[PDB]
Amino acid sequence: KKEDDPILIKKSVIRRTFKTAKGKDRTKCPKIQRLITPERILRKKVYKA
RNA sequence: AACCUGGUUGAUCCUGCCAGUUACAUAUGCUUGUCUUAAAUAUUAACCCAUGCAUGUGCCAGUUCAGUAUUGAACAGCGAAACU
Ligand SMILES: [Mg+2]
Ligand SMILES: [Mg+2]
Ligand SMILES: [Mg+2]
Ligand SMILES: [Mg+2]
Ligand SMILES: [Mg+2]
């Protein structure tokens, strides 16, 4: 849902899991762009200031 | 260094050039031992060109699910590619 909490977006992002050519075991995650974080809102407040 | 000398006649004083002398550029011939500098395919053909190189660029501050590393379970170090 749109009304939904950002942390629900955080928890639902896909994980990638894979085996390195070296034979190692690793897991990679994407970063969320557009995400509403405290930092965005702070910057906004400061500009209006 | 504000200087001139040789050549017309049988001899002479003139005009006048030629020639010498001087510097400086290219060129060249012979000859070349140190040290300090150092121009350099302008002139002829803005003629023709094999090959190599002479224009690239990343920070903490645009984009990383590359990779690496057993990394704050959204990423967070290092760091391609590729957008910008
Ligand atoms: Mg006469
Ligand atoms: Mg005579
Ligand atoms: Mg003369
Ligand atoms: Mg010596
Ligand atoms: Mg690059």
Side-chain angles (χ1 to χ4, degrees):
Chain A
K1 294 188 171 167
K2 176 215 173 176
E3 304 312 312
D4 209 344
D5 205 311
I7 199 185
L8 246 232
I9 325 176
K10 296 192 176 195
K11 295 172 167 195
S12 41
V13 144
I14 327 193
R15 308 285 155 178
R16 188 178 158 218
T17 292
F18 52 111
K19 208 85 173 180
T20 297
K22 298 184 186 183
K24 291 198 163 208
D25 227 343
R26 306 183 166 280
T27 283
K28 237 133 176 196
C29 299
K31 337 180 178 153
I32 302 160
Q33 192 51 53
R34 294 244 165 272
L35 186 54
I36 296 203
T37 53
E39 346 202 315
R40 280 189 116 206
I41 307 147
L42 173 63
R43 285 170 192 153
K44 177 156 181 170
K45 297 186 176 182
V46 191
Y47 177 66
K48 298 293 190 68

